[PDB]
């Protein structure tokens, strides 16, 4: 409660240190006759510091909040609910004017979600809403953290709709980061897979030098989601029910990436070899020889 930001910053650093040194020790509340672990009390004190007037103290508070993982589950859940003075700590710490505190909060959410998958489920919507933030480094860090917590989660329909509606990226670094995120991502809806295919082909026709990383991207995307690609397979191959369709241009990168996706999905899915057309089998035999690092061996 000092009137100088440096004292508060050093004090929150020291309180983080002492909480990490004695987490399970019991500290009594002055007014209430409640026995509380020291780490939870320090969690509350640091959470209160995320509302500090100075932004450097807020950055420090968010970083140390990330660094602690011995806190109880309900205390972890409290910082995301609207309404132990730790209520809405990350909510206020994720929508500040300063971008640096937002980056610190994003990284803190990454560490906390990696420690707690149950926390990650709650953090999914908050972190994917952050993708709309228009500071470049903020969105790169959000991409990296989302990729980091990807193993413990699976995206929802509306959250995926949200991230897709603001997925229009221009620069190379953000695009490559999105490609890696989509390599590691987990989704629950095939409509999101369709929208991802649409955006990736737009980014295929828009950026030729992105072809490599989008081919690899779709190679990893289908290997993970074979079940969601199976309805979308006749949606994409343009297989007419009762007509032999024209043989698509084997040099068209968009089409070649649609086959890469559908063949990486087919690896896990017996039912995919059935819905292949004749030219689909012909094209498969070629890209298995020519692009064996993208196309996997199948059981036709």
């Amino acid at each position: 409660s000092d009137d100088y930001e440096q004292v508060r910053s050093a004090a929150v650093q020291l309180i983080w240190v002492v909480s990490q040194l004695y987490p399970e020790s019991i500290v009594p509340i002055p007014s209430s006759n409640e026995e509380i672990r020291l780490v939870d009390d320090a969690f509350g004190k640091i959470c209160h510091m995320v509302s500090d007037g100075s932004w450097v103290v807020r950055v420090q508070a968010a970083k140390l909040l990330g660094s602690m993982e011995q806190v109880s589950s309900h205390f972890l859940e409290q910082t995301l609910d609207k309404k132990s003075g730790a209520c809405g700590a990350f909510v206020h710490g994720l929508e500040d004017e300063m971008y640096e505190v937002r980056i610190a909060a994003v990284e803190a959410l990454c560490m906390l979600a990696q420690s707690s998958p149950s926390f990650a489920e709650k953090c999914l919507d908050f972190l994917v809403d952050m993708f709309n933030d228009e500071i470049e480094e903020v969105r790169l860090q959000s991409i990296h953290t989302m990729r980091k917590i990807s193993n413990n989660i699976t995206l929802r329909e509306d959250q995926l709709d949200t991230v897709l509606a603001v997925l229009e990226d221009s620069s190379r670094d953000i695009r490559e980061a999105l490609h890696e995120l989509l390599c590691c991502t987990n989704v629950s809806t095939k409509e999101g897979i369709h929208l991802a295919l649409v955006e990736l082909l737009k980014n295929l026709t828009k950026y030729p030098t992105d072809r490599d990383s989008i081919w690899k991207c779709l190679k990893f995307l289908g290997s993970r989601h074979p079940t969601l690609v199976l309805p979308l397979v006749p949606e994409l191959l343009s297989t007419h029910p009762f007509f032999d369709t024209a043989e698509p241009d084997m040099d068209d990168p968009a089409y070649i990436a649609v086959l890469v996706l559908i063949f990486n999905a087919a690896k896990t899915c017996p039912t995919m070899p059935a819905l292949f057309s004749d030219h689909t089998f012909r094209h498969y035999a070629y890209l298995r020889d020519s692009l064996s690092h993208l196309v996997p061996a199948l059981r036709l």
């Binding site: 309404k83 809405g88 206020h92 500040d96 004017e97 971008y99 809403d129 500071i135 509606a165």
Partner: protein, 301 residues
């Protein structure tokens, strides 16, 4: 006197009044949660003898920012899904910018123009004032105004015509807020429908006829040749006014750390609860003055 940052509207300020050791801080109106175009209020450890705060919202936190925007856009999509029109009124200088940009970004998906019925001269003046006073705006805009001009809205309409047009998805932004008089009441009195005539109130509507009855059914009114509405017709009072809630007020009081607190710009039922909360929590005196009541405090200079 010293002016601080309030965050209510562009140029809103908290005015400290320091003479000798005695000092009084008047926050006027403020918002401790930053908007999409305005920052959060801040004041140093002034520790004054008295701190006069607004209390129009002594209610709990209004479910963050993303949830409110999501609910507002979901209601807008529900109203326009059946082809209904929307008739939100606003003062055209406060939360109008945030609602405008939010609805524009929502319309990036379908890309159909939305009519802004605040006067084209007034709209141009608002854009110009917001671009001349970039330092008063958010760091979000202060860092990204060079890259792009967010105030350059691609959707706008002039005035009377599209209001009496066919029942489409058009959402009107009336020039006078609070539904007290003007274009807002003129449009509202001529509009009805289940999906159409969606009236979303971001303001507070302190005592003006028609507008104030958001907590009521909004189907009674008091006027000559009054109309009736239906349940599907939006009478939702979205919490989009740039006012600090109870958590924000406690945050401000703890931030300033005053010797005493005084409450204005609110309702008595909310203000008595806020006073009880302040006295029970921070062990600091609070006051409940009525119009014409004189509140006197002692000083120890």
């Amino acid at each position: 006197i010293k002016a601080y940052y309030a965050g209510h509207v562009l140029g809103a300020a908290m005015f400290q009044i320091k003479v000798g050791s005695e000092s009084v801080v008047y926050t006027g109106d403020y918002n401790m949660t930053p908007d999409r175009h305005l920052g959060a209020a801040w004041i140093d450890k002034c520790r004054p003898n008295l701190l006069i705060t607004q209390s129009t919202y002594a209610t709990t936190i209004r479910d963050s920012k993303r949830c409110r925007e999501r609910d507002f856009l979901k209601k807008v999509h529900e109203t326009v899904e059946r082809g209904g029109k929307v008739l939100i009124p606003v003062f055209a200088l406060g939360r109008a910018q945030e609602l405008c940009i939010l609805l524009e970004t929502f319309w990036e998906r379908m890309n159909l123009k939305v009519p802004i019925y605040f006067s084209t001269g007034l709209t141009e003046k608002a854009n110009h004032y917001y671009k001349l006073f970039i330092p008063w705006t958010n760091q979000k805009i202060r860092k990204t105004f060079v890259q792009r001009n967010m105030f350059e809205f691609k959707h706008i309409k002039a005035f009377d015509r599209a209001f009496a047009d066919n029942p489409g998805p058009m959402v009107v932004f009336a020039t006078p807020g609070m539904l007290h008089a003007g274009q807002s009441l003129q449009i509202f009195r001529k509009w009805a429908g289940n999906e159409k005539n969606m009236v979303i109130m971001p303001g507070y509507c302190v005592q003006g006829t028609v507008g104030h009855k958001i907590l009521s059914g909004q189907r009674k009114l008091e006027m000559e040749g009054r109309q009736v509405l239906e349940v599907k017709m939006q009478v939702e009072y979205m919490s989009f006014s740039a006012h600090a809630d109870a958590k924000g007020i406690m945050q401000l009081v703890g931030q300033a750390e005053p010797e005493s607190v005084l409450l204005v710009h609110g309702e008595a039922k909310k203000m008595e609860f806020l006073k009880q909360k302040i006295e029970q929590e921070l062990r600091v005196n609070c006051y409940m003055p009525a119009n014409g009541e004189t509140v006197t405090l002692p000083t120890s200079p």
